Amino acid sequence: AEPGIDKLFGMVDSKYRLTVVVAKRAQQLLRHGFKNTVLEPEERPKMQTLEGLFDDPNAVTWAMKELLTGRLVFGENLVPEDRLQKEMERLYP
Amino acid sequence: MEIKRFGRIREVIPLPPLTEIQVESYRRALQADVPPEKRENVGIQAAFRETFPIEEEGLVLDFLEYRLGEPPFPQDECREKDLTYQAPLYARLQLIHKDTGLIKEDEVFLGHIPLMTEDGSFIINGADRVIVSQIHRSPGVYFTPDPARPGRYIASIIPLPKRGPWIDLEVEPNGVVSMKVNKRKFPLVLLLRVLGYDQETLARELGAYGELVQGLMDESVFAMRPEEALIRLFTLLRPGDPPKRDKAVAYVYGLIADPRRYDLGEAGRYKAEEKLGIRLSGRTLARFEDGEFKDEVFLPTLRYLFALTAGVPGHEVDDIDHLGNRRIRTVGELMTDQFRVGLARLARGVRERMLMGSEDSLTPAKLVNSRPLEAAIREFFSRSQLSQFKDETNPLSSLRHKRRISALGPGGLTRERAGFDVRDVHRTHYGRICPVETPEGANIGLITSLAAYARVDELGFIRTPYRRVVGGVVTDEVVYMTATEEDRYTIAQANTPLEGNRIAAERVVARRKGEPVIVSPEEVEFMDVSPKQVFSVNTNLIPFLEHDDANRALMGSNMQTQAVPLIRAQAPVVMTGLEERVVRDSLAALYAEEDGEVAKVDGNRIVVRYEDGRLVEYPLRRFYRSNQGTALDQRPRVVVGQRVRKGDLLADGPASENGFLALGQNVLVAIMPFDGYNFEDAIVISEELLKRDFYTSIHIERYEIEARDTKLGPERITRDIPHLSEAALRDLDEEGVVRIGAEVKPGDILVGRTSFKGESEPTPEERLLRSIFGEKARDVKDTSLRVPPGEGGIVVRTVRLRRGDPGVELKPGVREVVRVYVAQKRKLQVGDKLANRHGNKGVVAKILPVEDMPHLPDGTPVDVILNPLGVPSRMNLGQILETHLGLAGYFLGQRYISPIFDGAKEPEIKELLAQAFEVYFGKRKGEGFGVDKREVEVLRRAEKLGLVTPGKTPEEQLKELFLQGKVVLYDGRTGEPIEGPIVVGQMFIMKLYHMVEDKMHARSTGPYSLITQQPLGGKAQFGGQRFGEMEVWALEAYGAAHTLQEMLTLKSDDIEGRNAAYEAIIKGEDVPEPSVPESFRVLVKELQALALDVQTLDEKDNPVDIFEGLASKR
Amino acid sequence: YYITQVRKEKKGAGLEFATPEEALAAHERGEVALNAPIKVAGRETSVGRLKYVFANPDEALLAVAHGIVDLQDVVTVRYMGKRLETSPGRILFARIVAEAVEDEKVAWELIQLDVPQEKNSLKDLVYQAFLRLGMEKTARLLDALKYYGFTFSTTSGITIGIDDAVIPEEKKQYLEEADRKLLQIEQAYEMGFLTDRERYDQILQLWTETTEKVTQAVFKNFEENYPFNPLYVMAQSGARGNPQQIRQLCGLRGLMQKPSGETFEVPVRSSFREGLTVLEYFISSHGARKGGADTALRTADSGYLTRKLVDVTHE
Amino acid sequence: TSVYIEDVLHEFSTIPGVKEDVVEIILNLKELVVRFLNPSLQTVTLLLKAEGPKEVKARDFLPVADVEIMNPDLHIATLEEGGRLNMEVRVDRGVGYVPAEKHGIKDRINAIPVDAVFSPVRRVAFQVEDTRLGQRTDLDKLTLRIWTDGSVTPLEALNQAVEILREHLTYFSNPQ
Amino acid sequence: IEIVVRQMMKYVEVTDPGDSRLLEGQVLEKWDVEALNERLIAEGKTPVAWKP
DNA sequence: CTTGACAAAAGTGTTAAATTGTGCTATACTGGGAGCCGTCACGGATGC
DNA sequence: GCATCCGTGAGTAGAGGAAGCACAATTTAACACTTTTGTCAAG
Ligand SMILES: [Mg+2]
């Protein structure tokens, strides 16, 4: 079971909207190289390696954890899509 | 290790030769060694005399005799060079000129006839093959009731298959008796008039029934002459053709009276005479002579029909599934049938050649073209449903293959259109067809086995032996009888108690026409020979069969065919008594011909000097690869200077131990759950099995490659392959072939080959790259043979065939072919399948170190742990009794023979367990040890479970548990006992052909299909997995829209999408959006070829181009 | 199931006493058993409930490790502020659920403590936990149940021997009664009282009734004398088997059908433990083949229905 | 661990004049018991040269210093007149069970690796009896029964096992 | 089961065309004819009479 | 980066030899040949 | 009310598997020769 899956299912009206929000957020993290995250340094997911602890490379794992903090906003007709990417690219070149 | 035998029934005859159904039938057809003048009119001799003489209608070609020559190549040479083991056929013909009277004789070469090996198989194009016997409805005359309307019957006349049409005789509601031929129904009187039957003749014999004869008394055609009736009948049969007497008599005579076209058969003629009570001169419906037709069978058939409808006591309907109405076609008859087909084609080319071209100057050799005859025989032995790839996983596998009976094939039933009734166990199957051995699935009841004591008679009916009983005493006279003959007697069971030869029981269990009855000893007429005559060879190898459910006994007998030979194979502790004869009749071992002395013993050959003085040398087959990939070799069992008797064993064959069938190992088994690794048929084993090489088998694989002539140039097998390092070419010799003894792994080169590159100028980027490094492109490319993924081993043999070599027939354009044999030694591993003879099977899921296994108080650990939850719902209790008897033999050091339905019983097993306890526990007391503290704890619970008697001493209570097959067992991980006594014993377990090594496969990308551009299928092709319709439904029910779209486009046939996805992943990116699949583009084009305009539109109904503008005419 | 089922003894089984000291004193003399039901003053108790009184689950399970009592012995244990009368193995089952969900009070409401845990009771526990706790906590309870179930079945000593197929004593008496009634049906048939059809139907009715009585005699013998028999435990818990398959092992096989559909007049009166005769084995093979042909020839009919349903409702 | 036979390329072959094949001969070599008399010795090679007719036993190996064969009567092969056997057998020292695929040891080109079963212990059992001392009555009496192959005595094996258990008990000393 | 049966009762048969181009005995979907009828009532035309 | 070279690789008629396409044969000859029932059983739609 | 015609029957895996001849048209290959295109040496 994914951690906090019960709370994630309670945040949306339809279970398929949760999958849409998670998948689009993970694409945002991959495209900007995880520099747009809302997580604090002590909250970043980690994986254990022979050389030491490093950042978790799985973007889907990051998206689920961010959505549990309450710092993301999701909905329909929030912003124009072209204007969303332009500002996010300017903030995170 | 001594052998103890149970049972009371004394068999008066031994088993017949187990391959005589194949061997004896093919000898009768050929008649190869019978002198020509003493040959009987059977087999291919009967076919020669049927087609000949050939008359032009003044030239006659006649047949005198034939002979068979020596084979050109031996059996082992044919296997190596991919030839057919055959013999030339010569015919001695003479041509007679009727006008003049001059005769010429010469011998003409007719072709080659395949030869059967001593064990009963053929070598066709270098591969072993088996001809399977066919069962079908017997020809004759049959009477069945009318299903639509009661009180009415239908009479049928059935010839041999493809030897005439079926004839139906029915009484219509109007009262007219009608005859139906070739889907056409016409009154019977029209044909019955052609046979010269008048009004006075018909009413004399059939007028003793009533209103039925009135329907045969029409005066419209009674006065009509037989010649006029003949022409009128011809118009009804084939309307449209001009009515001529010359054409009319040709059709009628050729439909029911021509022996070359209509054949009732020897079995059919015998059936017709027995039923109708008549005597037939030939095998046709009517006899034509003196320019007229004469009746042979039509009148007696009609009398039976009328009398059956009237209700005379002596006439009854026929059961079509009765085994007296079904017959077997063996290999000799099936081969001879195709020989007659091809011979009729040869006579057709003789006729067209003797009326056109040099009629006055002819020779028999110039008339005869044997090409049609050879094509008929070649087609039968290659592409017939009954000619099958031989099963030789072990010697028992090939023996069973030769005794199978199939209802399918040419002239047989179809798998899809076969109903329930034809698949059932008929009551006449008793003693003739095994009731339990059959495949489950779409072939159930359509493929069966011959009973162990059965034999097929000359007409094709199965007979089973019975003992004559006279006046209450049983004699040793044995009579073989068919099902129809068996129905007339009261037959007692084989277990009937006897005092010598006198029947001792007052009440006897017997059968009367298949049903059980209780009778007095004076009413008995016959007796069964043994219980073994009811079952087949495979089922007869299962001990305690009477304690097993038939659904699980079917699995046990089938899976003995799939057992692989082991390097340390041994015979089971508990046997039935057929293990010796199976090895002997399979011809896999070597026996002495007569008394003599062994002179030379080697791993390759044995030389025996016989008492007449002559020396005989026997070469040994060593490390040979079978059709299934298992190694077959023979190991000598004698020493130099040893005296041998006639029939003594000289060398063991595969899966045999001192002449006994050995399909597995004898292991120590505990029946208990273990930590969930036994869950749902899974099996736990010990690492000690691997340490002593139990369940270790040898397998051999073959690889091949060719060097051809091409337009660009010839392919060359060479060691000098471009762009290859020395590490890759290390194990190749100077000729480019891997050396013998090398160890190969996936990706290693086996044979090196180069091919001339096709003419194609390179891409601009490559041209600049070659300019930078100053390298000149070569004219050849690497096309060498490499080890496929997941394979490998040791190279043990190479074979090189070249064009021009004697006996080598290579295809045009092929220069040479190289073959490499690779062998590996397989130990048991997780994922391998194991089974016993009672139908218990499962895969190995866990291998434990020896200190983890449960062990006996003396320190002995068990080998295998089986879950007790698989027993109760399968109801196969035979494995429990085998375990109890194997526990007694472990301590007493003896083996047992318990025949089926007459063998070991619990009081005898418990008397043996009492002796085994005296050595299992009396040994401990002498050594100075008492009862363990841990055994006292288990005994305290055992009497709360009601297993032991309260008040007894611990030694007496331990013996009470031993007589039930239970011991106190310790846990290896903790050292504490299991809380209850556990059943422990010895069991015989086989390792099956299905191994996880041959079945694991994976793929990322690979070959694609031509038209649909989708991935190929199959592990051998490196193909992908089929994601079918029901799998698509599951993804839809989940709501996984994006996962479903990837499988439809990005991973099957979106050519642009699958290229972009691969490039994105190797760059560390997410895969892009998919596009239109290619198979949809194919569907649009194929619909346009059907003149249908299919167009894709957008929201505004405007056209959308999905072909990128590549198919639009500007 | 094996740890949550209690023991029953018969040695005392009815003796009456006056004070608990009298009942305990008789136990050491060997007159009564630990789990035999007795009566102290007016109530029904056992020696184990009077002798072993534990202050908490840890003390009761420590006594099990020392071999003082078994997990199937009924004792007195104090748990959650109540004086319970159960076995240590039922207390152990309660702790498995409490630690898996990490809530002692909620887990106490989820379980039935006074019954052995069978397939249906365990299914009810899963559904209630899903309602109260969600998927994440329910998936943790499933793994704990899986872990302890495998551990306890290994060390308990479950095995199958030939003597575990116990033959009841009433089978011989029933088969003798049926012989007399069958011989009477034949007597009246010769007198013309009944025809061929009604004689046929009466023989079938006699054997249908006899088979049912043997089925109840098999299971009555188990629940009274061998309550821990491997076959009885497997069927009662729902692990494997049904009473129809048990009767064939321990009682009789019964009537068989002909290929035409009719039934043979003589049944198969032997079980798989005793062993069938050759004729009985052949008679039974008609129905085994018929069952196999039904499976092969009718799976296509079911799968064709599924494709019809999908294509009418997929939108 | 590894065997080399002259004029033999792999283990799936036969030798002229020899009754047994290479697979059977190797199965016989897995039953040989060799005792090293020097604790510092790690590997030795045993040489055999024979001509038929004779039954070659384990005593036909040439003598080597500080090496002893414990079962000299072990049968190896049967030689017919005209047969020859010239082989070198390598014996290593180790622990546990090591398949031939894991070590793959070959001293020369045509050598054949052999699965190694290094353990000298054949069977172990222990008994617990009921003893007493004065008033105390529930005391234990322990007996250990050890079966070995002869290269290591049961008393030597018992001492080595006690040291292994004692060594492991020191791992609970320093909590990190 | 109720989802499947709802698809089994999805069609109707015309008994009286009324003021429409439909034909007597024509089979069409129940959803379509109900939409067609309520449109005719708005324009004051005779409705279609159908049968389940 | 620009000249003079310099042979070479590629391009261009010319022609003899393989290779391919086509017409013709005069005693008289005038309607095919293979099939051949455990023929599969049941429901729906059409035409009488 | 009935005779005639037509489309339907679960999934995955394997592993074997009989005419010449004459002569005109057309295509191809061989062989020179002319022209174009790099290298080399200056410079
Ligand atoms: Mg199959």
Ligand SMILES: [Mg+2]
């Ligand atoms: Mg107390």
Ligand SMILES: [Mg+2]
């Ligand atoms: Mg050793």
